Amino acid sequence: ADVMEQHQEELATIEALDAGAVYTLALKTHVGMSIQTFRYFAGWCDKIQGATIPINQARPNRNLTLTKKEPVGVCGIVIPWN
Amino acid sequence: ELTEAELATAEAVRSSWMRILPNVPEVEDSTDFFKSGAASVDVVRLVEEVKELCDGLELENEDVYMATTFRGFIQLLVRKLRGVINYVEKAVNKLTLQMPYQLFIGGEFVDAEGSKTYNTINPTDGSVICQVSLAQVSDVDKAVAAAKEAFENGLWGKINARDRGRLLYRLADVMEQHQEELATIEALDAGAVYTLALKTHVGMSIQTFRYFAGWCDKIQGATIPINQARPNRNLTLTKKEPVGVCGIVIPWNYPLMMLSWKTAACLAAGNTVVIKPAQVTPLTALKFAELTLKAGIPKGVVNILPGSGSLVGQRLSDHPDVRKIGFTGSTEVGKHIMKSCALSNVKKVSLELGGKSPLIIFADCDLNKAVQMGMSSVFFNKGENCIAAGRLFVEESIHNQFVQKVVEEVEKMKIGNPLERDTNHGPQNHEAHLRKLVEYCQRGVKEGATLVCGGNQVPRPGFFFQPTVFTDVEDHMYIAKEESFGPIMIISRFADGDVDAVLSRANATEFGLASGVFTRDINKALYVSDKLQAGTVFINTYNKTDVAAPFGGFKQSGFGKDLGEAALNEYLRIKTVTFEY
Amino acid sequence: ELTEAELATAEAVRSSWMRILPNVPEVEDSTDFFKSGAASVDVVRLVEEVKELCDGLELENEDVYMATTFRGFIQLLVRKLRGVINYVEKAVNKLTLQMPYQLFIGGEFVDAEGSKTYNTINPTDGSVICQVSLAQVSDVDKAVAAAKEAFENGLWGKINARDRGRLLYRLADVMEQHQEELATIEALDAGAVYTLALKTHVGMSIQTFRYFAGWCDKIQGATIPINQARPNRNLTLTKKEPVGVCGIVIPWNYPLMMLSWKTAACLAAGNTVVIKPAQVTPLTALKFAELTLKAGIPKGVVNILPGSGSLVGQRLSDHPDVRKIGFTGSTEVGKHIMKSCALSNVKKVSLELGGKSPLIIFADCDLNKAVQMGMSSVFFNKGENCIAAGRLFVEESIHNQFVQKVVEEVEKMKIGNPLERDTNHGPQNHEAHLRKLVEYCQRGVKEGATLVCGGNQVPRPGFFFQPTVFTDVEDHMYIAKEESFGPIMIISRFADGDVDAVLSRANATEFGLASGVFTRDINKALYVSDKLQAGTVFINTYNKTDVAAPFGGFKQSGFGKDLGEAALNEYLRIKTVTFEY
């Protein structure tokens, strides 16, 4: 995001030539929310908590249960043109 | 003793165990069921097998977990095959009541040290309605011991969270069956109107237990993603465990509701509890204790000790076994609880020390709706409400119009016997409080506030009080600053289109529990909702709390919520297990 | 008609309304209760007032919300003052059953288009146990219409979340009263053993509804802190709304349990539902539909349509009113549901398409515990389990010892009538399935699987199958790759102290629903738990799911969880309201 912030005037220009988005809007929206998005989700990375569930103990034997939030693997993203 | 018929069944039960359990080389007297290797399916395969041998029987899975050994099982099976509470009767509201008048320590009604009692007052008549047992320091230590026994050694701690819920849900269904009974007791003990008692006092009590019962088995922890000590792996997780023993103290304005609000939260977390009901209103709590036995709550979970606040309440804060207090009442008494909490064993504390709730009213409002809500803010449950509308900041464009409507509607409000359905405004609680409200209104007029209507006692048997109104009230006055804690509407003018000016006046108060604002204009509503320094803001309504909605103080009103998901996090603690591999 | 006695009470009810409501200039026939200005306290003050006039009455708050106008109220009050299901009887297991044999569309048992029926089979005997109504395309559209009517127009949508919970909790308590009945029907219809049916099939069904009932009024959204358009303020919040109509399709392995797992989640979210029970096992679902009336579920909420999968199941995916499908069964049929979901109205989909679940066993393990869990992994509910242990990767140090113990314990396992408590292993479901299992074991021996024991039909009246075992099983073989869906233990050797090697073999599978690993060594356990590509890993246990614990596929096993908090997020949708001020 900080690298995209340094090249934000560059990306805003490329948006205007490629897409046709207005340079003023490109900084606030097209590049601005792009920077914000990466800054946001970067934050999430190490707060993606699971859960320890309280479940029926097979009495008198004890039973711990928990959830791990794992990644799926490979993501095939397709994006629009707008 | 073991007869011939019992030996025939005993050998068939031994023959079952051989077939049920996997290896089991010999089923000895000493041999255990679960140690051998038995899943929870084998517990049901056992019980159903015995129900073929014995016709009636009536056996459940609970007793199998208790009686693990063969000696214990056969002793239990044979026992049942071959094998009283003191009330105060009163026929009122077409119902023969059965109010307990004693302590409640470990699922057993017992007298105090030396059978020391005191009178509990009926504010409808004025006469006494039975003598209640006054709790002593010796009795407190038995209750805390019974609580600690129930938590550590007892059944409460062992059983599942889902089980605690199933019990707590039945407790609500038991309270639902005796809801007309509890509603009657509320009217006699507290003075709450019977119609309101069903909807609020008993209604939200039922809802509360039904709610928190639900939570029991959904109190999830968290597996944290943390810095792996590479290349070694590191799993981390949190368990939400119960604290232990909870020393709840409740106010007098709502006997049964405030009990439920705190109790149900503790019991859902998985805590044993030592409730301290208000001296002037114990009978609802003692009746609630009777119901715990019928619901099937283990004995020692709930403990109830009616008595003086300084005697009982102070011992709970000192006693080091208790790890949680949840006080709610006066500010000067409430700070003395938190002081003793420090000099004891650093126990957790949650406070709801009254308030002084503002209620802004703009010209954008409907007016006709502002009146009924303006009354139902102040004059609700005989005025006795912790979130009672303190000051009513009404706009100058509709001050004269608003007040004139209220005065008409105040005269309509029926006053009388709280059992009767005609009555809207009921009588106050203890007399000690009534005399304070008279001096409060006297002081209001003496300071310089225009008494519109009310402001004095009604000459009639009972401890009734007239719905009072005050107009032309400056911020410097006494009644503006200090809370009434009664049916006293305190109206204040403010200039037309002055949003920040009235907010400055409204927030200018060290107490700030709840607040409100009536308006159509969404820009004002949502703006004022942010600026008002109060934990429970209302918009186009008032006294619209819910068991799911959290509720708590900000400034001197206190900290630590009650009701909702937040309520549990007080009465729970968070263990943090960490592995490496 | 309105007599003299009724007019006397009617004018007293008019006299009440005048006193209850604030302004009310005239109480006309047309005049409404709530429009005038009435809080929820006034609803209770009304009902209790009428119970003074009329002695018996038996009035509740529900009917006041329905009958708002004075005409509607007096018509309703007078109506009650002055003012049959076709079963199949069968006396078995000391209980006279009452199994419905028809459809269930809008709280009403009705026949199909032309009274088209089919035989449902009892696998204990082999003979038929009554004819069941075969659902058609014309009937499906009535059910979806009844669902859409119930959601949009009906009572289900209007009432509170807390109310939906109170109904769903009573549904569990009603299912608890008829738990011995449901357990019997399971044994006749499915062939699940009566002892297991109480603990699992009916037991978890009860637990499930009790659980999700709890959730109803705790399905919290979120107020997001977002970029304020300074100096203008911006409030943002999320509402968790219900989707609408849910087209659930369930498998045959668990008739009542898999129904509850999906149904209870939908109903807790606040959805009307159109269940499609399995053709071969409908009777439990139809019996469940009878109980919804007793519980007091509004008519149109639950809809049940027994019939062919291609006829009924395919129409639900096409029909645009339905906004959610929750299929569980075979892969080739389940993929065809998701295909039709796309070419319709991009409706949501959740899948649980089998699972070739591995189960590693190390030398560190106890061995005696590994056997009973090794059996209870594979041989559980007549072998018919979606999380049944496919391959058992047992270590070479204790392969010969482990197998030799199993062979002894397999011979002990009682086989016979599932109603009788002696029986451990019950008979299979439909006969079509039995013949496939015979070819499966034949194909094993043909491709080179050492039949240790079992692997053929039992000479007996009924559709029984011997507990099978296979040893010396390579990864290239058929039985190793493809799932059995039956009581067939498939053991595989692996080298001593080869953790990554066996994990490579275990994860080498496109299906991966559940998995397990038995070991004392915590370093192995927690390592293997991470590496195993399966949604429900077990450690020193197996078939230890819970209603609170989430549960779902990863790869071809599918996506979208059932059970737990995650289950709701399928059958909910998240609105995002945003203000500016």
Place this chain on the structure above:
Amino acid sequence: DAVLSRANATEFGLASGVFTRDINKALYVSDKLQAGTVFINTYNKTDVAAPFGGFKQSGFGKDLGEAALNEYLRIKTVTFEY
């Protein structure tokens, strides 16, 4: 109700809006509008933290906010006994 009948009469329904001072109308209309991203006295006021997605034919599965992660994650469920 008449305009809400017309407004919701559409198989596509991603976002929506309503401009009004009257809070009774705003909050009522916010509930009734069948759209995943309702606006009140504003429009095109999304945020990286605020979730955003379709309802009907607009689709399913959110992007932006905490909800976005739950698409691209999977939830393992480890269970012990002791």
Place this chain on the structure above:
Amino acid sequence: HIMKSCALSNVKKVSLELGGKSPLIIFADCDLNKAVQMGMSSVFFNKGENCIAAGRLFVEESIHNQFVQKVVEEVEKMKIGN
């Protein structure tokens, strides 16, 4: 066609944002001057190319003629070019 191929392959997950048709109700209670700029900034935002673009504008009959007449003036002001 993406979701169809996702079925007959390896039963993978899918999230869709298939355009929309976003309504925008406007009552007489509204400010009007704020409705215009937001009414434009709903539709005419990023060269009109927006998945949450204001489809239909349900404006009230009391302020239909007044609203439209303001928009026409403000549309002519909107600069067009590089």
